[PDB]
Amino acid sequence: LGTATGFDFELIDQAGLGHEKLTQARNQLLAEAAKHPDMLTSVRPNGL
Amino acid sequence: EDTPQFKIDIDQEKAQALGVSINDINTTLGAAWGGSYVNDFIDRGRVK
Amino acid sequence: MPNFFIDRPIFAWVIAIIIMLAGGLAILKLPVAQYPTIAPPAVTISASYPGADAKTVQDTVTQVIEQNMNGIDNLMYMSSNSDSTGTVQITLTFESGTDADIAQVQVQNKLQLAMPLLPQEVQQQGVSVEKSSSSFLMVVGVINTDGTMTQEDISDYVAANMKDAISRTSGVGDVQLFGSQYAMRIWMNPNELNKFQLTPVDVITAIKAQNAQVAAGQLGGTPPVKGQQLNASIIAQTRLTSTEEFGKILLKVNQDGSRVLLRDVAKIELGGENYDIIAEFNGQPASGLGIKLATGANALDTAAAIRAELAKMEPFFPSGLKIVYPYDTTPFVKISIHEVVKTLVEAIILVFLVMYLFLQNFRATLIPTIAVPVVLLGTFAVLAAFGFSINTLTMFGMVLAIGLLVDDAIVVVENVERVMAEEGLPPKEATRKSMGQIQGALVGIAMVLSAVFVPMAFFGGSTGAIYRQFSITIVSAMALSVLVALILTPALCATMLKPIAKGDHGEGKKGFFGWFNRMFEKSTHHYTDSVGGILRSTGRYLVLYLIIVVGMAYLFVRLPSSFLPDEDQGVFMTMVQLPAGATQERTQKVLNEVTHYYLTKEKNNVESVFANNGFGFAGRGQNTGIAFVSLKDWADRPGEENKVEAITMRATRAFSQIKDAMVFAFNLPAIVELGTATGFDFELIDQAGLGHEKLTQARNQLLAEAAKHPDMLTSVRPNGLEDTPQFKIDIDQEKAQALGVSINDINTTLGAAWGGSYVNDFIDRGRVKKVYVMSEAKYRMLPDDIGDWYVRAADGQMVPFSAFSSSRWEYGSPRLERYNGLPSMEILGQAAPGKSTGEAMELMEQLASKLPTGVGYDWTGMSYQERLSGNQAPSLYAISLIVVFLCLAALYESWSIPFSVMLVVPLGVIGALLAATFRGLTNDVYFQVGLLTTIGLSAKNAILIVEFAKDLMDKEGKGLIEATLDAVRMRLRPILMTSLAFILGVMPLVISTGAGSGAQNAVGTGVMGGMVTATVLAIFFVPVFFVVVRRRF
Amino acid sequence: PGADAKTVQDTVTQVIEQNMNGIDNLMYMSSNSDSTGTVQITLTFESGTDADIAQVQVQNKLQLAMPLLPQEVQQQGVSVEKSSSSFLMVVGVINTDGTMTQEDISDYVAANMKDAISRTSGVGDVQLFGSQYAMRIWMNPNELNKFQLTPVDVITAIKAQNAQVAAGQLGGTPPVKGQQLNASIIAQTRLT
Amino acid sequence: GIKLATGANALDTAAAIRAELAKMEPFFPSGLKIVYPYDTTPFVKISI
Amino acid sequence: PGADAKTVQDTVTQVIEQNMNGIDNLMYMSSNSDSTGTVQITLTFESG
Amino acid sequence: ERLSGNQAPSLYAISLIVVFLCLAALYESWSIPFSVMLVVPLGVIGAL
Amino acid sequence: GSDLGKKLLEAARAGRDDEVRILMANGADVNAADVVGWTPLHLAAYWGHLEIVEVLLKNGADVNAYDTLGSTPLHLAAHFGHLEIVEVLLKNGADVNAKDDNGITPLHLAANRGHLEIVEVLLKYGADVNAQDKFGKTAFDISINNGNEDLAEILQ
């Protein structure tokens, strides 16, 4: 079913940027995520 | 339609008389003229 | 509704027509086969490891594969065995109802993934996943009559020139070669090898190097130099093609410029892949194809097709070569079909004759003759629809349904003829009334026989599949027979029967007929006077009913039970086992003796013997062998003395005289793959890692105790092989390392020379074939010869194999069962005479419970099935009896009247049991279905009488005894006619002898003996039953 | 065995993924390669996909990739499984005597219970909370050098001396005329 | 730890596993014992 | 790889084909073997 | 194409029989169906 | 060869004492050898069937019979750990210093499978402890290589 209002989202390296650049992209997304807590909750990675 | 074919014949006896390994012979002839896949490498994140 | 079609005969004709058209089309399109598939899906994995012993096979192959058989679906049990010719077999047995193709591919994929964990030699050899089928359509033997080609040659020919032909032949779903195609055999000579200082290792590496495929590329291949004009392939080395080439392989160049050539150290020839089987057919070399019929295929056609193809192969046969057909099920299937078609025709001639004898006008005698084919035709339709084939089971179920089919016609036509004679009504008003008088009962009879036969299909496993055949055949026949009797024959009656005067019972006629009619009218008064007396004195008859019920109870349990009778099949077989260590030559001398006996003492009956040295059920080895024996026709072998059961008794006695060789014969099971309905299959399991020797002991301990209850267990035995002397050779690592000798050199020298070593492929005559290196037999026979093989040291010196080895005998297992993953031993036995299987199993379990800890047991095979679905019969038959009640309750609108009818059931059963016990026959499925039909038919007559009787009270206000006597009078003629016809109709089956006759005997006896008592007893007991219940309630 | 997340992705995961094409009803496909040396590629199908054929297909494309995977990875056995992500049940096994260590209990579960349950129809996957045993050689370099041997020498000698060896028969077919004896030849066997 | 194959019946399969474990229990070494820490199937039986 | 069409036919196409016997609903079967070493075999099944 | 031609006659024959029978059953008549079944060439000639 | 001698070989191996008893009542051959030279004493000595061992010896069985490659029932017994059979056999004159065709001695085999009692018994009855096999190994050598220190001590 999913974990209720849980959303499940994927960030893709569509251009050969590398693991390292994609990590910075994810960091950049996550930061901005925390800037709208009226809309987004418990946003988090799933990996190490 | 029927194509021609170039039959090259290795002389095992003369190869042994001149101390050359039929396996290097076979590998030279094969690699040079037909190509040989060797292993993979990574091209901007893709196994190739 | 039957009014509808009395007024609309065309409509009803159309329905007839349509049904007959659907029937005829199904007849052109239905698969023909001996039996349906009844065994559950089984998938057998198979592998081989040349020169390897049963332990090596198990520890490197069988365990690996079994460890990976995970996550396949609907598996029931897995079981394996690993043996000393390097073979493994792993059989996964699936739930009944598994898609064998889903099952086979699931087995095949996990194996694939397990393939990198196997020995490299075994990977090189391949491992085959296959659906398990002992079902062969026929076996074509191929033999050379003029001593020009060996068994291998024949086989190679058959492979190269005959196999694929047959494979493409229509209706052939699978083909197996009884032999190998050629292989390139290098037969090494160790004296030469040591002369030039070479080993099997040099020989192998030279064959891998000089018999190679070398990719080379192209002239002018992309990317080219622009302006190139030619693009051509470069062909470099390809595979060798002749022995001349192999012999010219260069091993060593000398210090002398001379050449050590592979022909200078080895003998080179085409030969077999193995030499483990010697196969002969009347002493001459032989090979063959085993042909299985394809799904949906027609057996009679495929056979013809196979033969057709063969004939157009004969023009290119090399001189001396001849085809032979030592096993072919299609003549059975032909006889079967001809015999059933025979019976079904005699059936309508009989209803003709009986119909005329009584009713004596041709117009009536038409109405069954139309209606019976309509239903039989339309039964093939429903058969096809449910996906059934025309097989032996469905065919005899056709025969068991004649009585019910015949009767529906006779009942409707006669009751119109009687209403006419008694009431003087025109045939349209008379049928309309007559239908009004049986229309409910006929529908009732449909529901009730449903509740008889339908429960039978819902048995589980192998047995449920055999009952499913009869169930669907018989319910279909009867259901259309009710349709046809509510749709077709009412119409036909209203529009074909000539009128009859009121009171005209034909007594005023003259000649044979008028006499018969007065004679019968006298006997109907004779009869009703008799029953009227019986009805003054019900008590002694209730006492007689208990006597009947009691005799049936006694005869039931003391009639032995099987599930299908054997047949004189035209074929039987003969095991030949010899001691531990017995050679192939020795086993051939026994088989030679066995062969000579049949072609001398049984010249009159025997056509051929096929002698396979190296093979058997329990296992394989130079010391075992099967002869297969094929007889002339049942019409050239007169009388029971030339039956198989005779010929085998004789031969078995003759061969007990044979020294150092256990030798015996026996018939083939009715349905291949099934085993004795009196038998059990016992798996004894090492459940906590005890080891071989421990499980062997626990077995003999279990076998001893077993022999201590002869009253309960008989023929309790192991299925596998016994441990045997073997040659343990140990390699001194220390002496090897010190002498500069690699142990990989050592173990491939040994393995190649003494065990054979598969190298690579060559192409003989456009066919790809294997290359094996092995010693000449002359140097690999005796422990003494181990010192003649030399291995080269690092420093080039040639070190004799003895200088770094040592040796001793130990004992070891030449076969090694496993079961659901653990080591096992398979124990076989049956219940001692007069005892049931479930008992012999109860004891076998308790005898095991007192076995050493770490030893367990399971039930496999037939036993696994009956343990899970041998309990159902009284469950199922209960629901049956409940519905039959529930139905008759609704028919008559009475909770009590049902019993009157139900009470008829012992009356048919008794004579079936009597006729069985008399003729020595058995409680088997043909007998049991025939019971079911004998019950159903005598049920039928009961239901009609009670109905007529209950009606006469309900509607016309008659007193009980008045109604019962009138009922029993009107229903006397129809009951007589049906039984006389039917009884006569099942006559040829009882008398039948020769071809395929145990099946006919089984059906015939019980149906006829059950009918004599069902007819005689009922006409009296049924009015009795009815009056005691109406009175009590 | 011993591969980091990248060695596993660039020598296994990718090679596999590039073959996972043309597969009926596939919705997505994710995969993790981790430094324990493990891959799991997870092909997810539309609802109503027959899981049998869905497995038959994935397996088909996978066996094209197999020969391209490292030898180390093949001998570790590649698996293909159709199960629910979640756990149906956990079967625990303890010892109330304490005759048996955590490590021994696990080796018993793995060698005497697992396989039968892995073979039970319905059972999509079984995780052994522990580990079957292995003959563990634990090398010491201080002695390896002291004799001038290396891990290479070791693996060689185990392969040589823990050998299960096919070696033929005496009086084996095709035999010599007049042959007396038919007996297996037993040479090296697995160590125990 | 057991994962239920695709489509398969949870209650039915739990059963089959129990029957299989039963045939092993009589061969357990001294003091070896099964226990049942996590099972999602009883709730199905009870709630129904 | 690298084998003539005849070699590839003797050792690969013929082998596979002779096992494509008795399969349900098989209408016909076509197949070819070329000089690059490729093989394709196409079994066509009765519509339905 | 060879198959669609081979089967076409049989198709036409059973389609006539069906219509006829349906007519006999509906109109309780063998005459009404045979009157009708003779208009068939009149339509077939115009299509042809 | 005889009907009975084969029956005795079978019963000897299987340990069917009463069969052996009846067979000995009938003059079955205590010298019957199977396909590889094993007499029923061999069979008994190997398979661990003390009763039959005695019965056979009582009935004229040869305790120092030897097989195709030299193994004596003592060899088998010492090797498979049948202490009591060892003792009986040596009591009844079994050569404790028998060498098979590898120069293997019941000491060697016993040393090797590590049957310390059987070693000492064999030593008691005079097992030459400095005997060497084909490769010059003494039961001590077997003992040090197998890592058996108690054995090593017993062979001093």
Numbering used by the authors:
A (entry chain A): 674 to 721
B (entry chain C): 722 to 769
C (entry chain B): 1 to 1033
D (entry chain A): 50 to 241
E (entry chain A): 290 to 337
F (entry chain C): 50 to 97
G (entry chain C): 866 to 913
H (entry chain D): 11 to 166
Authors' description from the paper:
Resistance nodulation and cell division (RND) efflux pumps are secondary active antiporters that are ubiquitous across all domains of life.
For the V612N variant we obtained two crystal structures in different space groups, which represent not only the TTT conformation, but also the LTO conformation as seen in wildtype AcrB. Presumably, here, the closing of the DBP in the L state is also unfavourable due to the introduction of the hydrophilic asparagine within the aromatic cluster. This is likely less drastic than the effect of the V612F/W substitutions, but could still shift the equilibrium between the L and T states, hence, crystal structures were obtained in both LTO and TTT conformations. V612N also showed a similar reduced resistance for many of the tested drugs. Among the variants, V612F was the most compromised, while V612N showed the least compromised resistance.
